[PDB]
Design a protein around this motif. Sequence first.
Motif, PDB file in Angstrom:
ATOM      1  N   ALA A 159       0.842  -1.185   0.000  1.00  0.00           N
ATOM      2  CA  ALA A 159       0.000   0.000   0.000  1.00  0.00           C
ATOM      3  C   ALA A 159       0.880   1.239   0.000  1.00  0.00           C
ATOM      4  N   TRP A 160       0.388   2.302  -0.628  1.00  0.00           N
ATOM      5  CA  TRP A 160       1.144   3.546  -0.661  1.00  0.00           C
ATOM      6  C   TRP A 160       0.205   4.710  -0.932  1.00  0.00           C
ATOM      7  N   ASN A 161       0.657   5.900  -0.551  1.00  0.00           N
ATOM      8  CA  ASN A 161      -0.104   7.115  -0.799  1.00  0.00           C
ATOM      9  C   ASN A 161      -0.117   7.432  -2.287  1.00  0.00           C
ATOM     10  N   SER A 162      -1.270   7.886  -2.777  1.00  0.00           N
ATOM     11  CA  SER A 162      -1.441   8.229  -4.184  1.00  0.00           C
ATOM     12  C   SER A 162      -2.076   9.606  -4.338  1.00  0.00           C
ATOM     13  N   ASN A 163      -1.914  10.469  -3.334  1.00  0.00           N
ATOM     14  CA  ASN A 163      -2.487  11.807  -3.414  1.00  0.00           C
ATOM     15  C   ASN A 163      -1.893  12.586  -4.581  1.00  0.00           C
ATOM     16  N   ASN A 164      -0.568  12.530  -4.735  1.00  0.00           N
ATOM     17  CA  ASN A 164       0.080  13.261  -5.818  1.00  0.00           C
ATOM     18  C   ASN A 164      -0.347  12.725  -7.179  1.00  0.00           C
ATOM     19  N   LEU A 165      -0.417  11.400  -7.321  1.00  0.00           N
ATOM     20  CA  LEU A 165      -0.774  10.814  -8.608  1.00  0.00           C
ATOM     21  C   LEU A 165      -2.229  11.083  -8.968  1.00  0.00           C
ATOM     22  N   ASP A 166      -3.127  11.058  -7.984  1.00  0.00           N
ATOM     23  CA  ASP A 166      -4.547  11.285  -8.208  1.00  0.00           C
ATOM     24  C   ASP A 166      -4.974  12.708  -7.877  1.00  0.00           C
ATOM     25  N   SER A 167      -4.024  13.607  -7.636  1.00  0.00           N
ATOM     26  CA  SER A 167      -4.369  14.980  -7.298  1.00  0.00           C
ATOM     27  C   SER A 167      -5.195  15.611  -8.412  1.00  0.00           C
ATOM     28  N   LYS A 168      -6.221  16.359  -8.019  1.00  0.00           N
ATOM     29  CA  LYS A 168      -7.085  17.038  -8.975  1.00  0.00           C
ATOM     30  C   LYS A 168      -6.297  18.068  -9.777  1.00  0.00           C
TER      31      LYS A 168
END
Lengths: 47, 49
Positions: free
Chosen positions: A30-39
Amino acid sequence: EVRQIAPGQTGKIADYNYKLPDDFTGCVIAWNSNNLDSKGNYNYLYR
Amino acid sequence: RISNCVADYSVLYNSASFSTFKCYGVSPTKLNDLCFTNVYADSFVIRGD
């Protein structure tokens, strides 16, 4: 839900869409994906 | 103290507004079926750590 997605672990999403077996053998990543999925991303869903 | 009533633990659990809800002597799923004699709720505030 990282804790929830694991053998012998429960949660709101767990038991409703995905539940690992206790006897299973494998790996979970598991990993953070905020940057990849950032609006939000209503394409993502949860029943 | 809570007594002389019927507790719908199923509603409370499904109403998952709480982050961590764990019981060290019971399983959450079995709570709805199981019955208790004396129920005491202790409310206060602490730190995350």
